């Protein structure tokens, strides 16, 4: 439980400490300068924030570098802290 408490503050520490990384989605890096202010979240093309998938991107998440380094996403939170079997790689995670 306190391991998951350490991991609550891990997310809020790690994105500053290791620096960068984003929790955002596809369309990253590519021409944008768009927002979802018209309509409000719409799907089926307006250039693509998440309104579409897999046209001139194939990467789900990519670190935020902006125009100057030592930055990160403000909303570090996204996930839940949950305990399972031990894993220390993505390959190991898939086995179980």
């Amino acid at each position: 439980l306190n391991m998951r408490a350490d991991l609550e503050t891990y997310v809020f520490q790690d994105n500053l400490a290791t620096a960068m990384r984003r929790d955002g989605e596809i369309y990253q890096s590519i021409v944008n300068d768009i927002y979802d202010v018209p309509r409000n979240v719409t799907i089926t093309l307006e250039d693509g924030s998440e309104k579409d998938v897999q046209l001139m991107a194939e990467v789900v998440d990519l670190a935020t570098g902006e125009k100057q380094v030592l930055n990160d996403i403000r909303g570090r939170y996204e996930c839940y802290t949950d305990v399972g079997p031990s894993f220390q790689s993505m390959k190991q995670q898939n086995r179980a």
Binding site: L1, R4, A5, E8, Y77, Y80, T81
Partner: peptide, 15 residues
């Protein structure tokens, strides 16, 4: 419920 009880202060209180 599950968004703001993500914080461990909720689960500690049950125990």
């Amino acid at each position: 419920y599950r968004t703001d009880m993500r914080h461990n202060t909720a689960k500690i209180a049950v125990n």
